[PDB]
Amino acid sequence: RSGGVGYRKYQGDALWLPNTTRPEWLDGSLPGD
Amino acid sequence: GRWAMLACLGALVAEATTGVSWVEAGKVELDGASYAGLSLPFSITQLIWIEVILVGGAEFYRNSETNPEKRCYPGGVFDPLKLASEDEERAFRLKTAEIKHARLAMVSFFGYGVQALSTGEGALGSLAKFADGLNNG
Amino acid sequence: FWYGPERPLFLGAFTGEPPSYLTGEFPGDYGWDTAGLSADPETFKRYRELELIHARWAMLGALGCIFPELLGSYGVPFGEAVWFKAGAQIFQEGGLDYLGNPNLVHAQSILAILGTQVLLMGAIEGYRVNGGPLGEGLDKLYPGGSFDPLGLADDPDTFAELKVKEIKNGRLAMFSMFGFFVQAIVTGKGPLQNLSDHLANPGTNNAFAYATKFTP
Amino acid sequence: FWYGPERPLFLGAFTGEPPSYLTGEFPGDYGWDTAGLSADPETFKRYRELELIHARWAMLGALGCIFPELLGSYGVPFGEAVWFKAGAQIFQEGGLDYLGNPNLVHAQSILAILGTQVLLMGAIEGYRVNGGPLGEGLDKLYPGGSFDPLGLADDPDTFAELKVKEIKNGRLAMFSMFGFFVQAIVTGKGPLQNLSDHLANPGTNNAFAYATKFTPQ
Amino acid sequence: EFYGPNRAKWLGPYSENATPAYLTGEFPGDYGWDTAGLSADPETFKRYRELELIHARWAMLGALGCITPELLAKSGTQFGEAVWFKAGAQIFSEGGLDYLGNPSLVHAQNIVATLAVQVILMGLVEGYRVNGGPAGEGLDPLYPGESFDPLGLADDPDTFAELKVKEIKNGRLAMFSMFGFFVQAIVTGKGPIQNLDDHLSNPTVNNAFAFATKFTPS
Amino acid sequence: EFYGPNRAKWLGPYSENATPAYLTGEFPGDYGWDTAGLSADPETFKRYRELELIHARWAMLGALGCITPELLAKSGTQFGEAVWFKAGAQIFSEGGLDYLGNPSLVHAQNIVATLAVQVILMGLVEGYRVNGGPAGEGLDPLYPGESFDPLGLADDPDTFAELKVKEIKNGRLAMFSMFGFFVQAIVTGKGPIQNLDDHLSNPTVNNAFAFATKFTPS
């Protein structure tokens, strides 16, 4: 059982801005991305 | 990253016992080779030949692997616990923990040196100077 | 409770007052447009933005002025403890000190503090128009995104009444914040001094204690 | 050796008859419910939820009583190395110096300490009931997820005995803290301080010396 | 409201997911909280429902009973030891006691006789409460009614069900606050108004942390 | 009497409706009193019958053992310590714990060796009370049989059922009177006959209100 309260899922990838896009040569295969 | 976080911890544990800051660790053993307050028989000329020969071959053997992933995370003998050797999702968050401890290490060690250039004080001696005036004032 | 047609209005038990264009699906609608400032509904949209930014800057504006006499009278040695004389802390030789401690920020001149100040709010107030690295296509008033981490803005009926709790906390904040400018120019001391003054003498430390202060 | 009817019980080889509702299925099952508190199969779950949280909160507690006084004996100038005197360190002007070091934490306002603890522990015990960004829908006691990073709980076979080792170490720690509260009220000394006095002369520095401590009138 | 699934909870939305199957919102005060789980036996839970309301109604009598000497002694009326954990000890004085200020009042002198009146009066009422008698014989043991509700407040069932929850929430404050009153008197050693007389002047120091070192031994 | 549904109860005429229906009178001591409702589960109630009986059988030994070194001290024979709640302290004296005043008697010296044999053999019987051993294996864990009845008294099962009720009632006296002994001794600090002789001396001052203000807070 679960309940989403006190936080938000954000459906995303946690980039270094809250909303920008990913550069093309970087793909999420590496752990530090 | 791996040299940095192995050095950031070593910049404190060496100070927390001896009281010699990492900045002034040079002259204090140029005269006498000590470690945890116990003397050691090596001249500093002997220390360099031991250093260059030994850590040379490690940095030569590290340059012997040809796979670009296996040059990063070799494992094998270097993973005796076999933690990140299986269970690829469980190994992945282990790898994200090393790079975050790598990125935080390099900034923290670049933190030590710049404030040691200004103040001339070490890792923890330049910490107490900030808490000196912050507590009283 | 504060929405819909059958809501309480600014006159309370009266119902013949509101100027019939508003319906009450927006937080704090009491129909109080007696002078008719916003009968144009497109014009009425621009005030609702303009009230809320006035509401949010005055809520932190009030909290940004209670503390230096709250902390300063109760054991915190500031540089200067009154909010409407606080701007003179930069004038001194040692500069202003955050919480009276000189080895902090320790700002000295004016040629750099407002030099960076107009550029930071030159961007983020312009990010409120559009753009901004926190979210591009969003609502201009209640965007969500990385401004609401806690997820309290999710239950929309509960979210609509937190908006009511955002404006009612804010409308009495703005009404209080105008009250901060008035009693400062008349009396000349900080407000918790005036709290200590009124509890000392309730009858005659009132507004009539200095009603003859502006006599020509 | 640990589950089923061929498990050990609280009386061992001479155990005779355990209670009926203890089948050798769950950890720590030594059949010791002689007063019969948990005959209800629903309420017996609630105590297993409640024994373990007491068990985990007591195993980490024992390294908060033994461990500062132990470091104080080996050359660390603590403010108060004795654990029941440790709260009074915030009311002296030196403040709560972590490890006796002034350039560490240095707490001054005691009401600001728990002023932020309640916001955290409130949000962190409420995560244990439900939700939480770590593990959303998971087990109430053994989630794994990112509470188990190393993966010592991978196979379901070995996972049963680590649950046994969690609770036997756990019940042993809870035994010592019904201890730890008595030996501080009685002696007024640290727990290893009582251990240092017992090794000097055992036949005299035992609890029968304090047998007349609560004598009336 | 206050009943069913959409009612009030114990941890707010945090206890909304985990709630016992026997705690559903039928009875007043079901915030859904049995973290020991000891009420899954329903007739045993029936007894703790009884024990909660009984410990709340006898709470609310002594709730205001421990403050009415204190705020009236300073409001002008003369009292002899108007402190509730010592106001029962006033009978050892040879002048006995006053009911407000006078010996012309009820004027108890000997305490051995006043218990003989005391025990036999609740010897019947507590038996009347559990069995019946002159004030009814066969009604609800938790809400009897017309022999003690003449005023008609308990008539409308949509109003009466809310008055159920109003009854124990005024009592769950009362059961909690006098659990204070015991402890705030053992630790400090004065009346709760006189504790507040220290907390209104100096809130920062005069609180419970000022006496935190009181019970530590040597 | 003391059996059947027509038994007499904990309030007599004020208790014929509050009795839970599982309380019949088939057990010794069933007096219609489960007001807190702790034992609605009968198998749970089965364990509390053991907890009532074993507490009864230890208190009946415990009542007389506090008595016989106190009245017989007034019979002309000194007992070293005449007070019960410091009677354990006399093992640390110069002659140690004499059994009675003769040093040619038991004459206990070493406190560790007293506890040594004690805790090892009490674990056998209190473990043999669970499974069995010398005194039988599959008997009743409450009333085993003629192994503990050397005088043939455990026959005539109607008289034997009468002696069961007389076994717990004399226990419920003793459990209540051992409950008395510890309280008056941490108030007054005297043996219960030494408390009795002074209430026999002056009954007016020597009520329970003699030290009502003894534990006042400051």
Ligand code: CHL
């Ligand atoms: C049924 C009676 C009832 C009446 C008559 C009112 C009327 C009012 N309500 Mg309302 N309410 C009433 C019931 C209720 N109100 C409310 C909730 C609210 C809210 C939240 C608010 C109001 C506000 C108002 C005001 C709206 C008009 C205004 O702003 O006047 C303003 C103008 C005046 C009052 C004239 C001033 C008269 C004064 C004597 C002039 C003084 C002269 C100067 C001293 C001279 C200057 C000297 C110079 C030269 C130095 C007005 C006072 C608003 C308000 O008060 O904002 C400030 C407001 O925000 N009401 C509730 C709860 C739902 C009610 C319950 O029944």
Ligand code: CHL
């Ligand atoms: C509502 C109309 C009203 C107006 C315009 C005034 C204005 C005045 N009062 Mg009066 N009062 C008014 C009602 C009341 N007053 C008082 C009690 C007092 C006292 C105790 C005192 C005054 C004083 C003053 C004077 C201002 C100080 C000064 O130096 O004057 C010179 C300045 C001017 C004449 C500038 C005129 C004001 C300017 C045009 C702005 C005003 C704009 C509008 C009035 C709208 C403002 C908001 C409205 C809705 C309230 C001035 C005569 C003081 C005084 O006499 O000192 C000399 C003083 O001590 N008043 C009471 C309580 C019974 C009132 C009841 O409603």
Ligand code: CHL
């Ligand atoms: C066959 C012999 C055997 C006996 C007699 C026991 C007996 C016991 N085991 Mg078991 N075990 C035995 C075999 C084994 N046990 C275990 C594993 C365990 C575990 C893990 C545990 C037990 C526990 C227990 C206790 C259960 C009830 C209790 O809490 O008593 C408590 C009451 C008494 C012992 C009597 C009263 C205490 C005291 C001796 C009286 C002395 C009087 C004071 C000096 C007076 C103080 C003065 C005033 C001020 C009051 C009891 C000590 C439990 C335990 O440790 O409880 C603490 C427990 O957790 N056993 C194993 C391994 C498989 C065994 C192997 O054969």
Ligand code: CHL
């Ligand atoms: C929750 C666990 C906890 C416990 C049991 C204690 C108890 C203690 N604190 Mg501490 N504290 C605890 C957490 C905290 N304290 C403090 C802040 C302080 C201060 C400022 C001081 C203390 C002091 C003390 C000591 C009082 C001496 C004493 O009790 O006499 C001897 C008697 C005993 C040790 C018996 C204790 C057993 C306990 C009563 C039963 C255990 C169950 C508890 C009721 C559960 C705790 C609360 C529940 C509801 C969660 C004692 C070690 C004082 C001190 O150290 O001076 C010498 C002191 O000045 N504490 C904070 C920050 C707000 C805490 C965070 O939660």
Ligand code: CHL
């Ligand atoms: C109709 C009259 C009648 C009354 C009033 C009672 C009364 C009682 N009988 Mg019953 N009986 C009665 C008829 C009969 N009884 C019995 C046979 C029995 C038996 C065998 C037993 C009882 C028991 C009881 C008690 C059960 C409830 C309880 O636990 O009390 C709880 C409530 C109180 C004791 C009153 C509260 C005390 C007072 C307010 C406290 C004093 C305050 C101090 C000054 C200070 C307090 C400290 C502060 C500071 C914290 C109760 C006292 C049981 C018993 O013996 O319990 C003692 C029991 O075993 N009765 C028979 C023969 C069939 C009866 C014939 O009619």
Ligand SMILES: CC1=C[C@H](O)CC(C)(C)[C@H]1/C=C/C(C)=C/C=C/C(C)=C/C=C/C=C(C)/C=C/C=C(C)/C=C/C1=C(C)C[C@H](O)CC1(C)C
């Ligand atoms: C099972 C059974 C069976 C039968 O049949 C019946 C019976 C008998 C009833 C039962 C039994 C039971 C029991 C035994 C119980 C016990 C418990 C315990 C003791 C717990 C502890 C428990 C304990 C606990 C929690 C504890 C915890 C602790 C802590 C946190 C601490 C903390 C701290 C520290 C670090 C130190 C510092 O200085 C401070 C503080 C802060 C103070």
Ligand SMILES: CC1=C[C@H](O)CC(C)(C)[C@H]1/C=C/C(C)=C/C=C/C(C)=C/C=C/C=C(C)/C=C/C=C(C)/C=C/C1=C(C)C[C@H](O)CC1(C)C
């Ligand atoms: C629910 C639950 C659930 C889960 O699961 C588990 C658990 C946790 C266990 C649970 C909980 C519980 C609780 C909390 C309880 C509490 C209670 C109380 C506190 C009561 C009080 C209670 C209290 C009370 C009665 C009190 C009362 C009082 C009184 C009458 C008073 C009297 C008086 C007066 C008039 C005055 C004068 O001058 C004197 C005197 C004489 C003094």
